[PDB]
Structure formats: structure tokens, C-alpha cells
mmCIF file with all atom_site columns, C-alpha atoms in Angstrom:
data_model
loop_
_atom_site.group_PDB
_atom_site.id
_atom_site.type_symbol
_atom_site.label_atom_id
_atom_site.label_alt_id
_atom_site.label_comp_id
_atom_site.label_asym_id
_atom_site.label_entity_id
_atom_site.label_seq_id
_atom_site.pdbx_PDB_ins_code
_atom_site.Cartn_x
_atom_site.Cartn_y
_atom_site.Cartn_z
_atom_site.occupancy
_atom_site.B_iso_or_equiv
_atom_site.pdbx_formal_charge
_atom_site.auth_seq_id
_atom_site.auth_comp_id
_atom_site.auth_asym_id
_atom_site.auth_atom_id
_atom_site.pdbx_PDB_model_num
ATOM 1   C CA . UNK A 1 1   ? 4.226  47.582 -19.058 1.00 33.16 ? 1   UNK A CA 1
ATOM 2   C CA . UNK A 1 2   ? 5.366  51.607 -17.835 1.00 32.33 ? 2   UNK A CA 1
ATOM 3   C CA . UNK A 1 3   ? 3.423  52.174 -14.514 1.00 29.84 ? 3   UNK A CA 1
ATOM 4   C CA . UNK A 1 4   ? 2.108  55.479 -13.578 1.00 29.59 ? 4   UNK A CA 1
ATOM 5   C CA . UNK A 1 5   ? 4.047  56.639 -10.661 1.00 25.58 ? 5   UNK A CA 1
ATOM 6   C CA . UNK A 1 6   ? 1.405  56.709 -8.154  1.00 27.39 ? 6   UNK A CA 1
ATOM 7   C CA . UNK A 1 7   ? -0.260 53.732 -9.543  1.00 27.88 ? 7   UNK A CA 1
ATOM 8   C CA . UNK A 1 8   ? 3.200  51.518 -9.298  1.00 27.56 ? 8   UNK A CA 1
ATOM 9   C CA . UNK A 1 9   ? 3.180  53.285 -5.494  1.00 26.07 ? 9   UNK A CA 1
ATOM 10  C CA . UNK A 1 10  ? 0.138  51.459 -4.775  1.00 25.94 ? 10  UNK A CA 1
ATOM 11  C CA . UNK A 1 11  ? 1.115  47.916 -6.688  1.00 22.15 ? 11  UNK A CA 1
ATOM 12  C CA . UNK A 1 12  ? 4.492  48.163 -4.046  1.00 23.86 ? 12  UNK A CA 1
ATOM 13  C CA . UNK A 1 13  ? 2.072  48.716 -0.771  1.00 23.46 ? 13  UNK A CA 1
ATOM 14  C CA . UNK A 1 14  ? -0.290 45.921 -1.844  1.00 25.60 ? 14  UNK A CA 1
ATOM 15  C CA . UNK A 1 15  ? 2.500  43.391 -2.619  1.00 27.20 ? 15  UNK A CA 1
ATOM 16  C CA . UNK A 1 16  ? 4.312  44.512 0.935   1.00 26.09 ? 16  UNK A CA 1
ATOM 17  C CA . UNK A 1 17  ? 6.850  46.767 0.376   1.00 25.76 ? 17  UNK A CA 1
ATOM 18  C CA . UNK A 1 18  ? 6.688  49.565 2.206   1.00 28.32 ? 18  UNK A CA 1
ATOM 19  C CA . UNK A 1 19  ? 8.674  49.265 5.218   1.00 27.63 ? 19  UNK A CA 1
ATOM 20  C CA . UNK A 1 20  ? 10.297 45.932 4.057   1.00 27.51 ? 20  UNK A CA 1
ATOM 21  C CA . UNK A 1 21  ? 13.555 45.376 5.960   1.00 28.19 ? 21  UNK A CA 1
ATOM 22  C CA . UNK A 1 22  ? 12.882 49.247 7.243   1.00 28.35 ? 22  UNK A CA 1
ATOM 23  C CA . UNK A 1 23  ? 12.965 50.066 3.570   1.00 27.43 ? 23  UNK A CA 1
ATOM 24  C CA . UNK A 1 24  ? 10.107 53.062 2.299   1.00 25.09 ? 24  UNK A CA 1
ATOM 25  C CA . UNK A 1 25  ? 8.445  53.034 0.333   1.00 26.26 ? 25  UNK A CA 1
ATOM 26  C CA . UNK A 1 26  ? 9.614  56.842 -0.943  1.00 27.58 ? 26  UNK A CA 1
ATOM 27  C CA . UNK A 1 27  ? 12.461 54.600 -1.083  1.00 28.48 ? 27  UNK A CA 1
ATOM 28  C CA . UNK A 1 28  ? 11.549 51.461 -3.470  1.00 26.66 ? 28  UNK A CA 1
ATOM 29  C CA . UNK A 1 29  ? 10.136 54.015 -5.627  1.00 24.68 ? 29  UNK A CA 1
ATOM 30  C CA . UNK A 1 30  ? 12.879 56.126 -6.177  1.00 26.68 ? 30  UNK A CA 1
ATOM 31  C CA . UNK A 1 31  ? 14.973 53.161 -7.174  1.00 26.53 ? 31  UNK A CA 1
ATOM 32  C CA . UNK A 1 32  ? 12.157 51.952 -9.857  1.00 27.97 ? 32  UNK A CA 1
ATOM 33  C CA . UNK A 1 33  ? 12.280 55.085 -11.303 1.00 27.09 ? 33  UNK A CA 1
ATOM 34  C CA . UNK A 1 34  ? 16.437 55.911 -11.482 1.00 24.85 ? 34  UNK A CA 1
ATOM 35  C CA . UNK A 1 35  ? 16.538 52.063 -12.931 1.00 22.92 ? 35  UNK A CA 1
ATOM 36  C CA . UNK A 1 36  ? 14.272 51.666 -15.021 1.00 21.79 ? 36  UNK A CA 1
ATOM 37  C CA . UNK A 1 37  ? 11.561 54.624 -15.439 1.00 20.26 ? 37  UNK A CA 1
ATOM 38  C CA . UNK A 1 38  ? 9.274  52.337 -14.144 1.00 21.09 ? 38  UNK A CA 1
ATOM 39  C CA . UNK A 1 39  ? 9.406  49.993 -17.544 1.00 21.33 ? 39  UNK A CA 1
ATOM 40  C CA . UNK A 1 40  ? 8.973  46.724 -16.312 1.00 20.86 ? 40  UNK A CA 1
ATOM 41  C CA . UNK A 1 41  ? 10.692 45.361 -19.942 1.00 20.95 ? 41  UNK A CA 1
ATOM 42  C CA . UNK A 1 42  ? 13.655 47.566 -19.573 1.00 21.42 ? 42  UNK A CA 1
ATOM 43  C CA . UNK A 1 43  ? 16.889 45.175 -19.902 1.00 22.72 ? 43  UNK A CA 1
ATOM 44  C CA . UNK A 1 44  ? 20.825 46.173 -19.889 1.00 20.55 ? 44  UNK A CA 1
ATOM 45  C CA . UNK A 1 45  ? 23.362 44.427 -21.369 1.00 19.97 ? 45  UNK A CA 1
ATOM 46  C CA . UNK A 1 46  ? 27.179 44.857 -19.473 1.00 20.30 ? 46  UNK A CA 1
ATOM 47  C CA . UNK A 1 47  ? 29.054 43.940 -21.679 1.00 20.99 ? 47  UNK A CA 1
ATOM 48  C CA . UNK A 1 48  ? 32.156 44.451 -19.708 1.00 22.90 ? 48  UNK A CA 1
ATOM 49  C CA . UNK A 1 49  ? 31.174 41.059 -17.118 1.00 26.60 ? 49  UNK A CA 1
ATOM 50  C CA . UNK A 1 50  ? 28.357 39.458 -19.582 1.00 27.88 ? 50  UNK A CA 1
ATOM 51  C CA . UNK A 1 51  ? 25.450 39.992 -17.709 1.00 30.34 ? 51  UNK A CA 1
ATOM 52  C CA . UNK A 1 52  ? 22.329 41.736 -18.107 1.00 26.01 ? 52  UNK A CA 1
ATOM 53  C CA . UNK A 1 53  ? 19.883 43.989 -15.686 1.00 23.02 ? 53  UNK A CA 1
ATOM 54  C CA . UNK A 1 54  ? 16.152 42.528 -15.578 1.00 24.70 ? 54  UNK A CA 1
ATOM 55  C CA . UNK A 1 55  ? 12.769 44.732 -15.544 1.00 26.83 ? 55  UNK A CA 1
ATOM 56  C CA . UNK A 1 56  ? 11.791 47.020 -13.240 1.00 25.37 ? 56  UNK A CA 1
ATOM 57  C CA . UNK A 1 57  ? 14.461 46.993 -10.356 1.00 24.25 ? 57  UNK A CA 1
ATOM 58  C CA . UNK A 1 58  ? 17.057 46.182 -13.198 1.00 24.54 ? 58  UNK A CA 1
ATOM 59  C CA . UNK A 1 59  ? 18.177 43.068 -11.192 1.00 23.89 ? 59  UNK A CA 1
ATOM 60  C CA . UNK A 1 60  ? 21.421 41.694 -12.619 1.00 27.48 ? 60  UNK A CA 1
ATOM 61  C CA . UNK A 1 61  ? 21.844 38.195 -13.677 1.00 26.85 ? 61  UNK A CA 1
ATOM 62  C CA . UNK A 1 62  ? 24.833 37.278 -11.740 1.00 24.97 ? 62  UNK A CA 1
ATOM 63  C CA . UNK A 1 63  ? 23.577 37.080 -9.106  1.00 23.91 ? 63  UNK A CA 1
ATOM 64  C CA . UNK A 1 64  ? 19.655 36.583 -9.290  1.00 23.91 ? 64  UNK A CA 1
ATOM 65  C CA . UNK A 1 65  ? 18.388 35.158 -11.562 1.00 25.83 ? 65  UNK A CA 1
ATOM 66  C CA . UNK A 1 66  ? 18.616 32.698 -14.548 1.00 26.68 ? 66  UNK A CA 1
ATOM 67  C CA . UNK A 1 67  ? 19.064 33.809 -17.675 1.00 26.81 ? 67  UNK A CA 1
ATOM 68  C CA . UNK A 1 68  ? 21.392 30.419 -18.858 1.00 26.62 ? 68  UNK A CA 1
ATOM 69  C CA . UNK A 1 69  ? 24.217 33.040 -20.350 1.00 26.55 ? 69  UNK A CA 1
ATOM 70  C CA . UNK A 1 70  ? 25.398 34.187 -18.354 1.00 26.74 ? 70  UNK A CA 1
ATOM 71  C CA . UNK A 1 71  ? 29.202 32.992 -17.157 1.00 28.76 ? 71  UNK A CA 1
ATOM 72  C CA . UNK A 1 72  ? 29.687 31.554 -13.848 1.00 24.08 ? 72  UNK A CA 1
ATOM 73  C CA . UNK A 1 73  ? 26.031 33.020 -12.793 1.00 23.78 ? 73  UNK A CA 1
ATOM 74  C CA . UNK A 1 74  ? 23.609 32.082 -9.633  1.00 24.48 ? 74  UNK A CA 1
ATOM 75  C CA . UNK A 1 75  ? 20.418 32.382 -9.557  1.00 23.41 ? 75  UNK A CA 1
ATOM 76  C CA . UNK A 1 76  ? 19.585 33.571 -5.511  1.00 22.96 ? 76  UNK A CA 1
ATOM 77  C CA . UNK A 1 77  ? 15.800 34.717 -6.396  1.00 18.26 ? 77  UNK A CA 1
ATOM 78  C CA . UNK A 1 78  ? 15.499 31.627 -7.857  1.00 16.03 ? 78  UNK A CA 1
ATOM 79  C CA . UNK A 1 79  ? 13.830 32.819 -10.885 1.00 16.22 ? 79  UNK A CA 1
ATOM 80  C CA . UNK A 1 80  ? 13.592 32.662 -14.660 1.00 17.59 ? 80  UNK A CA 1
ATOM 81  C CA . UNK A 1 81  ? 15.427 36.196 -15.910 1.00 15.36 ? 81  UNK A CA 1
ATOM 82  C CA . UNK A 1 82  ? 12.524 36.181 -18.077 1.00 12.22 ? 82  UNK A CA 1
ATOM 83  C CA . UNK A 1 83  ? 9.740  36.181 -15.079 1.00 16.52 ? 83  UNK A CA 1
ATOM 84  C CA . UNK A 1 84  ? 11.710 39.483 -14.192 1.00 20.03 ? 84  UNK A CA 1
ATOM 85  C CA . UNK A 1 85  ? 10.154 40.826 -17.740 1.00 18.70 ? 85  UNK A CA 1
ATOM 86  C CA . UNK A 1 86  ? 6.623  40.304 -17.118 1.00 18.92 ? 86  UNK A CA 1
ATOM 87  C CA . UNK A 1 87  ? 4.002  43.571 -16.822 1.00 21.40 ? 87  UNK A CA 1
ATOM 88  C CA . UNK A 1 88  ? 3.236  41.627 -13.291 1.00 21.34 ? 88  UNK A CA 1
ATOM 89  C CA . UNK A 1 89  ? 5.693  42.844 -10.988 1.00 16.41 ? 89  UNK A CA 1
ATOM 90  C CA . UNK A 1 90  ? 4.883  40.233 -7.751  1.00 16.83 ? 90  UNK A CA 1
ATOM 91  C CA . UNK A 1 91  ? 8.069  38.002 -8.931  1.00 18.56 ? 91  UNK A CA 1
ATOM 92  C CA . UNK A 1 92  ? 10.583 40.872 -9.426  1.00 16.77 ? 92  UNK A CA 1
ATOM 93  C CA . UNK A 1 93  ? 8.965  42.100 -5.554  1.00 16.00 ? 93  UNK A CA 1
ATOM 94  C CA . UNK A 1 94  ? 9.871  39.272 -4.380  1.00 12.99 ? 94  UNK A CA 1
ATOM 95  C CA . UNK A 1 95  ? 13.277 38.596 -5.892  1.00 11.83 ? 95  UNK A CA 1
ATOM 96  C CA . UNK A 1 96  ? 13.723 42.559 -4.900  1.00 10.64 ? 96  UNK A CA 1
ATOM 97  C CA . UNK A 1 97  ? 12.881 41.087 -1.114  1.00 9.24  ? 97  UNK A CA 1
ATOM 98  C CA . UNK A 1 98  ? 15.100 38.272 -1.686  1.00 5.35  ? 98  UNK A CA 1
ATOM 99  C CA . UNK A 1 99  ? 18.236 41.604 -2.181  1.00 3.31  ? 99  UNK A CA 1
ATOM 100 C CA . UNK A 1 100 ? 17.290 43.643 0.621   1.00 4.54  ? 100 UNK A CA 1
ATOM 101 C CA . UNK A 1 101 ? 17.469 40.579 3.054   1.00 4.62  ? 101 UNK A CA 1
ATOM 102 C CA . UNK A 1 102 ? 21.045 40.788 2.129   1.00 6.75  ? 102 UNK A CA 1
ATOM 103 C CA . UNK A 1 103 ? 23.631 42.529 4.089   1.00 6.56  ? 103 UNK A CA 1
ATOM 104 C CA . UNK A 1 104 ? 23.664 45.567 2.260   1.00 8.22  ? 104 UNK A CA 1
ATOM 105 C CA . UNK A 1 105 ? 20.034 46.367 2.015   1.00 6.66  ? 105 UNK A CA 1
ATOM 106 C CA . UNK A 1 106 ? 18.668 49.158 -0.114  1.00 7.98  ? 106 UNK A CA 1
ATOM 107 C CA . UNK A 1 107 ? 22.256 50.036 -0.835  1.00 7.19  ? 107 UNK A CA 1
ATOM 108 C CA . UNK A 1 108 ? 23.112 46.414 -3.443  1.00 9.43  ? 108 UNK A CA 1
ATOM 109 C CA . UNK A 1 109 ? 21.667 49.524 -6.009  1.00 10.64 ? 109 UNK A CA 1
ATOM 110 C CA . UNK A 1 110 ? 24.253 51.845 -6.622  1.00 13.65 ? 110 UNK A CA 1
ATOM 111 C CA . UNK A 1 111 ? 21.923 53.747 -8.298  1.00 17.51 ? 111 UNK A CA 1
ATOM 112 C CA . UNK A 1 112 ? 19.893 53.946 -5.102  1.00 19.82 ? 112 UNK A CA 1
ATOM 113 C CA . UNK A 1 113 ? 22.918 55.434 -3.421  1.00 18.83 ? 113 UNK A CA 1
ATOM 114 C CA . UNK A 1 114 ? 23.438 57.499 -6.590  1.00 23.73 ? 114 UNK A CA 1
ATOM 115 C CA . UNK A 1 115 ? 20.217 58.906 -6.504  1.00 25.16 ? 115 UNK A CA 1
ATOM 116 C CA . UNK A 1 116 ? 17.914 58.227 -3.268  1.00 28.91 ? 116 UNK A CA 1
ATOM 117 C CA . UNK A 1 117 ? 20.391 57.916 -0.436  1.00 30.85 ? 117 UNK A CA 1
ATOM 118 C CA . UNK A 1 118 ? 20.206 61.187 1.850   1.00 29.06 ? 118 UNK A CA 1
ATOM 119 C CA . UNK A 1 119 ? 17.853 63.119 -0.458  1.00 30.93 ? 119 UNK A CA 1
ATOM 120 C CA . UNK A 1 120 ? 14.539 63.913 -0.398  1.00 33.06 ? 120 UNK A CA 1
ATOM 121 C CA . UNK A 1 121 ? 12.224 61.252 -1.774  1.00 31.79 ? 121 UNK A CA 1
ATOM 122 C CA . UNK A 1 122 ? 9.199  62.396 -0.476  1.00 34.81 ? 122 UNK A CA 1
ATOM 123 C CA . UNK A 1 123 ? 7.295  63.410 -3.961  1.00 35.77 ? 123 UNK A CA 1
ATOM 124 C CA . UNK A 1 124 ? 7.563  59.867 -5.362  1.00 34.71 ? 124 UNK A CA 1
ATOM 125 C CA . UNK A 1 125 ? 4.819  58.786 -3.052  1.00 32.50 ? 125 UNK A CA 1
ATOM 126 C CA . UNK A 1 126 ? 2.959  62.158 -2.790  1.00 31.35 ? 126 UNK A CA 1
ATOM 127 C CA . UNK A 1 127 ? -1.007 62.118 -3.248  1.00 26.98 ? 127 UNK A CA 1
ATOM 128 C CA . UNK A 1 128 ? -0.599 58.659 -4.008  1.00 28.18 ? 128 UNK A CA 1
ATOM 129 C CA . UNK A 1 129 ? -3.396 57.322 -1.216  1.00 25.88 ? 129 UNK A CA 1
ATOM 130 C CA . UNK A 1 130 ? 0.011  55.288 0.694   1.00 26.16 ? 130 UNK A CA 1
#
């Protein structure tokens, strides 16, 4: 499923993301935007370390979800990576929350640093009623 901007904003808000561990909705929207273009089926294989990024938040197989094919990987969100490829984002949201509970917080995603950190991310939630 490829979400439309405001549709995703409300979907994330209903799921408890607005201010989760101090992270605004606009930040989560900027993250999903640059990670997958709001596409729940987005995937990216990393040939160098044999891991894969799954879903709308592009969560990595090495530490967060299990796909059975990543060397010495763990499954911190205790989910099948397949759960991160559903149209329904509840599981991906729970896993995204699991990721930010770590010390780095939203900074866990280097793309957030590159395109969202210290940026005007207002435009992502404007007019979405959130």
C-alpha cells in the first residue's frame, strides 16, 4: 500500500505516534517519506552485510525483525519481517516504537539525520487535521 500524506498522518496519530517518546508526528512523516515514499511494501537489500530493510519505515533485519536469512541477526521487535510488509501498519508502528525506545531515539535512522533533523518538517502534517 502506498499511503497518501494526510491519510498516513492520521493513521499514525490513531496509532499513538504523535509525541511518542517526544517525537512529533511531522518527524515520523518525514522519516516514512524519505525511507519509503510512504510505501508499505518497500524493501532494500544490503549486499554488504546481507540484511534487508522492510516496510514504510525501512526497518532492518539484522536487529529488529526475523527473515531467517540474515547472518547472526536478532529480532528485537519479535516480529516476522513479513509483518512489516502489510498494508496495515500497526505492527510496523509497534516496531518503530521499539526502535526509538533505544538511546538513539529517532536518530536510529540515519536518513532521519540526513533529511529531517534540524529541518522545517511542518509541511508534512499541514492541513491533515492532526
